Amino acid sequence: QFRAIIESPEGAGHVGYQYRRNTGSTMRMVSDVLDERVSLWDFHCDPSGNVIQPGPNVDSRQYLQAAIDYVSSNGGGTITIPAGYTWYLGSYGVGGIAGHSGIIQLRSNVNLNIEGRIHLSPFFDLKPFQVFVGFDNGDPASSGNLENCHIYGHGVVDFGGYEFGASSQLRNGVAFGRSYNCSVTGITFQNGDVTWAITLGWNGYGSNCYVRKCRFINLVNSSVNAAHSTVYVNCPYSGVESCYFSMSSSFARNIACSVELHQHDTFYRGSTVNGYCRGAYVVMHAAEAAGAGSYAYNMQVENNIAVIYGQFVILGSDVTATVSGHLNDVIVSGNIVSIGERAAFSAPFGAFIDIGPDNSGASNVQDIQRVLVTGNSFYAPANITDSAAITLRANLNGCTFIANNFDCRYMVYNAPGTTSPVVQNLVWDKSNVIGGTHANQRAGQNLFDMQFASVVNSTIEVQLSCEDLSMFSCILFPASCQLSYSKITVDSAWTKSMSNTAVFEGNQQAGANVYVSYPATVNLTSYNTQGAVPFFSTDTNYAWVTSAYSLSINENLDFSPPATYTNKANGQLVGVGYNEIGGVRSVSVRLMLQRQV
Amino acid sequence: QFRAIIESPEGAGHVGYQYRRNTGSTMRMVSDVLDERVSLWDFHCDPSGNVIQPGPNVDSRQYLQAAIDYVSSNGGGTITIPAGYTWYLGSYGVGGIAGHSGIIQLRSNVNLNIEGRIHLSPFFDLKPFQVFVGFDNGDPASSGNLENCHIYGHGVVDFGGYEFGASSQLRNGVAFGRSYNCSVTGITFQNGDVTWAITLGWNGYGSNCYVRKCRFINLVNSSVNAAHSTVYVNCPYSGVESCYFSMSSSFARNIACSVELHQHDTFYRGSTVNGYCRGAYVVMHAAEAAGAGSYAYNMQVENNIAVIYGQFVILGSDVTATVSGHLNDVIVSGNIVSIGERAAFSAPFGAFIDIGPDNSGASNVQDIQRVLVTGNSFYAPANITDSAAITLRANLNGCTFIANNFDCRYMVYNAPGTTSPVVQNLVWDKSNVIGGTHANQRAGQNLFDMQFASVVNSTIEVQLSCEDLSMFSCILFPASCQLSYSKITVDSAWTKSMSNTAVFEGNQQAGANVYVSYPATVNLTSYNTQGAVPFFSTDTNYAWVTSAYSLSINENLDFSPPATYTNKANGQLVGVGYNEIGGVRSVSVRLMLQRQV
Amino acid sequence: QFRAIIESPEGAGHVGYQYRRNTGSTMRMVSDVLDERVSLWDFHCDPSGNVIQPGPNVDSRQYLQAAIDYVSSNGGGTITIPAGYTWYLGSYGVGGIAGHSGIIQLRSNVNLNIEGRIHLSPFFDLKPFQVFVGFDNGDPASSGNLENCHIYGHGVVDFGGYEFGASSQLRNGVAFGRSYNCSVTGITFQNGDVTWAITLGWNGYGSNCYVRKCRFINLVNSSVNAAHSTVYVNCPYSGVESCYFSMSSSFARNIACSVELHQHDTFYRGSTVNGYCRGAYVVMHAAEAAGAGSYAYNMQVENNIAVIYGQFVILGSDVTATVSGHLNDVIVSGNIVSIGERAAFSAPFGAFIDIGPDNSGASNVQDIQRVLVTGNSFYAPANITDSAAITLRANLNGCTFIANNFDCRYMVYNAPGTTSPVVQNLVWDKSNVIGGTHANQRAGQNLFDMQFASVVNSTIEVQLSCEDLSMFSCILFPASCQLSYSKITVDSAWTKSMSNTAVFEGNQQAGANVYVSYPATVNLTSYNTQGAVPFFSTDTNYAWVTSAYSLSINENLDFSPPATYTNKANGQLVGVGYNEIGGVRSVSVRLMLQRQV
């Protein structure tokens, strides 16, 4: 009678226990203590309650769902996915997650400690899927929330290596949904062809979601894959920290991005990226503004390490029929980034910052301002023509660069015959150091190629740190680019032998509120008079010059040209030199031309 | 006979077990394995040992204390506070923690894994409390240490929403006490009116205490609350990382600070703050110097994200009758901070850095030096008159600003008719970018308003990046401010139309060791002579000028004024221009005035 | 019959259990649930299976190894080392780890949760040891890999305080070996005399190894100890974050370094160091290039806090007979570092950055370039003569400094009569702030002491922020140092009273592509003529000057010297001043001398 009870499933509920024989402790039963924890083993059984061994011919989905459902009913807990086993998933889930191609439905307060491996079975080959889904409805707008759900451990989610079946399909690892206080920590996501590994939030709904100390390895493998971003952050007060991202496929170099930050108060820090096209999108989509407003602000990309083939940070905002998105108050700092070894033009255009047009290619919808890019290093190998500190391809309302080291082909670039951005408040401080890797590679090119509709309230302080006499100019403005209320300077160091330093093809440097200085070579002739004697430029293209001074030595004993010059109404420079002996003098001098500076 | 044993509390101690049937493993009893873990359930029982269910009518305090006391007696371990339950605390603790209004006493090597919720019962309404206390004596000076105590998990400490009863009361979540190697990780502290959530150390006693990945939500709710700082770090080699802080109450905007760093080798990094008055105090109180000395050095505030209503970082030090506090070797970097939407003067004065007078208002006790503020961004909306990069309100022995982006009303500010700080070694590098949000808002205001007793060994390199013709001046020194051994420059860009650029109301720019340059408009007249001809200023206020040069074009054909000028004993400027044709000339020219630069 | 089964080691395998009486759960036995976890207690038994209590007279090694071996055989898991006990190790391991003086052999997928203490017994006194070893062969080249091995918890590894027996011995805590996805988290390593606490990887073999939230306390204690580096990172995609390092021994101040980064894509962040000689080596040893190539790139040292006695970051690379090592793409940012209180020359030369010769002292093997040092603060007390922002002691192919605050004796230093580095692409931006702690201490010293074979493509923009008239010069080039294609400037602020500002002992400033400016005092005499009149320098050492301008006021009424000057063939300066009344004039003027700038 007793023996029957003990051998039955209620047996442990009849064996008494008291902690460490402490007479002050609770008099419990063994089952009570065992009930303090829970694992997949407690649900991975047949209809008679006999345990089933996991394996490639067993679909563990229903058992894991039963475990989640049950623990949810008790107000939460943590379910262990045991180490030393691979648990295969081989069918779709049902109900609310079916509209998301869901496999498992996550529930509030139910954490998963993944110590073993979770693997997708070949049922999923060529099919869409989202492995873990926190939505509870096929329509995310009708979904309830997921709260207090954490996935962590030393285990692995393996996507089975299966290619996408069609470019239009979506695949995801964890979609937390309308997610509040959810996180993934320590998990390795590997061996797939997916759209995302993890998505946080839904159109601004959610908060306090984080991805920390995760690894993402080889998650693009085919030409069918339309696009890949490993973590898409779509709720505020959320971010990615201390993660590792690696791709090996050729396709990843063209399509894969590590992180996207799509809502305010989000961050991407302390991570390492290899083999990707792009580092991070930092954007406000008007279409995603429902949950947290139409502004992406307090956006932080800091202290990351990356080898990429396209652009590191892409900035943007856009509009819908009724909502306008805005991006402001962004900081990009402490990152060390290189374009990996590749042929020129063999991947999307290399850039540290890209100001990206919208998804339809429009460059006149953006509202991007108050961005600080500081204390970063960027490098691109000498052969990579398509590399720039900033590719400025859409309207920009402000971006500030201070104290970076940029070693690539271009500093500021946009292509002519493409977009014509309207640029305001572009600040390039003199503390940005321009590297020399691309010296001698710049035939026919302008280091700062200002291919814009207009530039206002901008500062470009060019400072070279080595010679590059191959370049056509340091900075060039086409006649089509209006320039006003701006400061453009070219420091003289390493420029003595340059034919062109700053070029203004529409003579824009003459503007009332343009403040400019740059070196030029000027031919002068003096009057004959002995003593104090004027020297005048032969050319008459200096009506805009407020002062100029000598950057040349005087090889003569019998006279000296002026140290400094002003101009005249007819566009000549004029200054007072000294003829020890009389005579008409003719000299060619290197001058720093200055306007209002 | 056997049946009786099995059903008794020693039953599990009679059921044999060997790990995975391994014949090489220990032959144990089931109780031995169960004894490897411990939970509140093992102590949450009545005097007959029957388990008690937690709930709002059950006071769990004595049971949790019994658990802590017992595990301590075995040299430590980790007690789980089970998920799926709310455990209410409804009485004060006894003994050493009673002097601290303590609820639970923490003990060395006894960790708490909080997975469920800990809630305060209405017994605590209008009363003081400190929930977890690591002191073992009512007098902290007589207390032993708390060592190796970690509180972690996915659970929650909820303060029940109760208001303070009186402003003089104190409330805290965790007071680790004289704490060595203690930490809180992952916990959410919420729904209260408290002084602090967590305090680390006691007057410099302690080491290696940390708060990581915690959330602090809505911890001020009344006008009775005197003051709130969420984490107060009062031992060295300690800090706060990757935390989230949010307040929603109006009162929090006026009284709440996220962190205070009060001892050397402390840090605050990677955190996000919303709804607070202040970011962090970084201070050395002489009254707190007992355990780790009278110097706060190696203080780090980095890579945080904040929306606040008052000051981001407040620096200070002070004295007692017998001890002098010193603050030095501080770094504030990578932070992105905004003043939230508010009316001018509706919260404490907005600032990125504040040099704060002591608790009695004294501005002549401080010893603050070797501070680096670099690579931060600050923004305040255009209407917020009371916003400054630095409010410099007490004596300052040094602070260095490099490569920040400050977009607010003032750069350097102090109020006239208040304190008169003595300032040394204030360095504002030219790489600080001054934003344009407050353009046109500055009528009657000085961008750098130097309301100090004196300034020495300081550098202010003003560089505008857009026009603001509303401001009275870029930088102004009242006659009461001595200025010596300093460099003050105003770059000409965007200044052509400014009536005043740099203003020295006591003519302080004439000092022997003052190095200055700024733009001015000067009226000149020449002699009649044809050829090389002198031009002289009409005014005689330039006896201090070492050189000047033209920032204006010359619209004339028949003559040119000098490109460059020196001065004369009588205070006139003089230079040599050129009269192609003779005649007295009279011109008004924009000049860069230079002294010793 | 039943009673016998129940009391036997298979007893728990006969007591039934079903989770929380859920009829949908697996019908299990108690043993199945207990088998979900494992501890040292399951293996710490005698040959009859009776548990053995740990203690100082019990060697726990064989039992822990048995536990690891068994769990490995089941595909992994986590073994707990129980809290409340000290587990002593008192013998060497056997097999593959014997060649490494190994104690315990780690195995793939077998994690250790150390909650208690692991202590070395006096068997190890005066002997070599490596406590945990992941190699499986005495020859690391013949070793298999260690994968997915994590050591974590609140516990402690204590090295027993034993001194090294001989300098040639090696001691280590954790050698992960050829290690992929291995980590140590939360552990305190203390009380020893060891070579390393943790090593990651082997000669570039390994990946994704990390040390996080560990403490390292008092790990050098004798003069026998040859060298100590607490963590040596010898695989890529690996790093150290949020750790604490402290030493108290005098010997540690001379020999101990906190971290070494020896492979690409490695990092050291967010850590605090006290009592060490050095912060981090960042190097590529040719001898270590087998697993990951001959380039150390993407090296990050960020946001650390340190008090050290020697050098913070040491850069280097070297060669073997057949392999050349290269170091490039490095970032050092956000660190706050001081040289601790010590006598001048009482520890290795104080430096923020050191360019270190190879292990044989060779300075002509290095290939170091594309290094960015930005946003750091460094301080050394006034008495410490041997303190420098950079000690540049070996060939350097590039290093860029932007926006740092350096407060120490020297900015750039190398000793004369030692190495003669060949320097390229050294960039010192004007945004580096030079502190004043060492003002008045610099008799006979050059702030930038350019003791090199040659300097090319370099920039030194000196900006003082206070006076130091004690120094011999701001920057000095000996005649032995070639200088070409470089920019050297000394801002005039705080220099008026300096006898020497920039010194070129070989007249190197005359080079065709040298761009220089600095202040000097010049004696001039004029001709007698009334009106516009030339002034000429008495000395003829200005043939290299392209322009000069006045930094002095003119105390005269009757004349003015020129505001600006050029030169003549004979090396005189010449400019045009103005004699209101005639007469030969003689003046001594402070000028800014400019060449090509």
Ligand SMILES: CC(=O)N[C@@H]1[C@@H](O[C@H]2O[C@H](CO)[C@H](O[C@H]3O[C@H](CO[C@@H]4O[C@@H](C)[C@H](O)[C@@H](O)[C@H]4O)[C@@H](O)[C@H](O)[C@H]3O)[C@H](O[C@@H]3O[C@H](CO)[C@@H](O)[C@H](O)[C@H]3NC(C)=O)[C@H]2O)[C@H](O)[C@@H](CO[C@H]2O[C@H](CO)[C@@H](O)[C@H](O)[C@H]2O)O[C@H]1O
């Ligand atoms: C892969 C990726 O992240 N690409 C981004 C791109 O994102 C957009 O394209 C995606 C393509 O996969 C997504 O669109 C697909 O998915 C949508 C969402 O799926 C439905 O809803 C979810 C919740 C549900 O589980 C599913 O079952 C579906 O029912 C589909 O509606 C759409 O048809 C698909 O093509 C992505 O959608 C977002 O996905 C996230 C994460 O899952 C969700 O949280 C959002 O709700 C959802 N958003 C919307 C509006 O539906 C698309 O947003 C980015 O747009 C670009 C950004 O870069 C570009 O724009 C900026 C700003 O103007 C410019 O600066 C750049 O220059 C320009 O290139 O980047 C890609 O990398």
Ligand SMILES: CC(=O)N[C@@H]1[C@@H](O[C@H]2O[C@H](CO)[C@H](O[C@H]3O[C@H](CO[C@@H]4O[C@@H](C)[C@H](O)[C@@H](O)[C@H]4O)[C@@H](O)[C@H](O)[C@H]3O)[C@H](O[C@@H]3O[C@H](CO)[C@@H](O)[C@H](O)[C@H]3NC(C)=O)[C@H]2O)[C@H](O)[C@@H](CO[C@H]2O[C@H](CO)[C@@H](O)[C@H](O)[C@H]2O)O[C@H]1O
């Ligand atoms: C809320 C807060 O942190 N405010 C700080 C302010 O701190 C001071 O005021 C506090 C008000 O709550 C504290 O004072 C109260 O508490 C003291 C401590 O309580 C006793 O001791 C503890 C251990 C015990 O558990 C309790 O039961 C009590 O017996 C009381 O003695 C005092 O009477 C109360 O008003 C705070 O005290 C410190 O608290 C910490 C954390 O608990 C303890 O570790 C310290 O031991 C204790 N220190 C002392 C000396 O007792 C007070 O320090 C700060 O002073 C200011 C700093 O800013 C100001 O000064 C700087 C530097 O000069 C300037 O730059 C600024 O401009 C100026 O404003 O900031 C507030 O935010």
Ligand SMILES: CC(=O)N[C@@H]1[C@@H](O[C@H]2O[C@H](CO)[C@H](O[C@H]3O[C@H](CO[C@@H]4O[C@@H](C)[C@H](O)[C@@H](O)[C@H]4O)[C@@H](O)[C@H](O)[C@H]3O)[C@H](O[C@@H]3O[C@H](CO)[C@@H](O)[C@H](O)[C@H]3NC(C)=O)[C@H]2O)[C@H](O)[C@@H](CO[C@H]2O[C@H](CO)[C@@H](O)[C@H](O)[C@H]2O)O[C@H]1O
């Ligand atoms: C203590 C320390 O880290 N010092 C470094 C120094 O490192 C070199 O010296 C070490 C002295 O302890 C090591 O050498 C010893 O150990 C070697 C390895 O041991 C064997 O192999 C291991 C795997 C096995 O378990 C053991 O049982 C042994 O069989 C011995 O071969 C050698 O004889 C010992 O002296 C260190 O070796 C490396 O150790 C790591 C970690 O264990 C291993 O992963 C590597 O395989 C091993 N490397 C090699 C090549 O064997 C030595 O590398 C550094 O060299 C210097 C760097 O600074 C100097 O050089 C740079 C670059 O040129 C310059 O810029 C500097 O100016 C110059 O000073 O720093 C010391 O702090």
Ligand code: NA
């Ligand atoms: Na869908």
Ligand code: NA
């Ligand atoms: Na245009």
Ligand code: NA
């Ligand atoms: Na008290």
Ligand code: NA
């Ligand atoms: Na005064």
Ligand code: NA
């Ligand atoms: Na060996």
Ligand code: NA
């Ligand atoms: Na030489």
